[PDB]
Amino acid sequence: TMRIAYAGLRRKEEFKALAEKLGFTPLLFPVQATEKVPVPEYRDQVRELAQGVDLFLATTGVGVRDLLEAGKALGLDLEGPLAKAFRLARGAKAARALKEAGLPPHAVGDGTSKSLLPLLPQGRGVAALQLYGKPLPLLENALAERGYRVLPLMPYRHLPDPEGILRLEEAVLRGEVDALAFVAAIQVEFLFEGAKDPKALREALNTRVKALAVGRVTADALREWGVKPFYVDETERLGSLLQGFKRALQKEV
């Protein structure tokens, strides 16, 4: 059977289950390390929050406390703008941190992102989304659909895993994988930036190893590095990606 490498950090077990169900061998080659570092652009995003927003969404209690503390490190009044914003909390922990600050949310989800979807008001202006580690593309898209300009507030990002990157590059160059699935643009960036032979990597991904992308942003990151994706899923569902891939393989013959 054909082997599909997965470059993602999360949803590894979901990827495995989907691949096995569809008749592929799943291999796991993450390019991000578990340890995180500050996003230097964060300081500017908090600055923008301090300007005023229409909607604020809190996802974790730790993350709310961290955001408020970032305000202090930066000399910015966040309570002012947040008190004027429509506020939502993903779950009870976020809701509790907001209450500690005297900013109780208008509504509280069930602890999942998707539970926020039926709570989103329709509007205009900026929707600030408090994040902590992990990106939330389905929520960010939903907010855009509801009329808002999205201000992500992500204080930290995963570092590259230099040895993980060399392992994946070597699997690709040696022909040990048949396809490689990327779920974020930063995975493409990390892989090429940390490769020993980016020129050979690009050629292999154009000729021998099928590059698969979850989302157009991931697809366009491949294009930035001179790789034509074999298949791009725009639904941002891992199940759709591998079903669509299989169909794309069939359309080759």
Explain this structure.
Residues 14-243 form the Tetrapyrrole biosynthesis uroporphyrinogen III synthase domain. The protein is an alpha/beta fold and 253 residues long. It folds into two domains: 1-34 and 159-253, Rossmann fold (3-Layer(aba) Sandwich), CATH 3.40.50; 35-158, Rossmann fold. It is 44% helix and 21% strand. It has eleven helices and twelve strands. The strands form three sheets. It has a five-stranded parallel beta sheet with strand order 2-1-10-11-12, sandwiched between helices. The longest helix is centred in the first third of the chain and has 14 residues, at 61-74. The protein starts with a strand and ends with a helix.
What is the terminal-to-terminal distance?
A: 17 Å
How many DSSP-defined strands?
Answer: 12
CATH architecture group name of the largest domain: 3-Layer(aba) Sandwich
Order of H and E elements: EHEEHEHHEHEEHEEHEHHEHEH
Helix content: 40-55%
InterPro entries: 4pyrrol_syn_uPrphyn_synt_sf, 4pyrrol_synth_uPrphyn_synth, UROS/Hem4
Pfam families: HEM4
GO molecular function: uroporphyrinogen-III synthase activity
Protein name: Uroporphyrinogen-III synthase
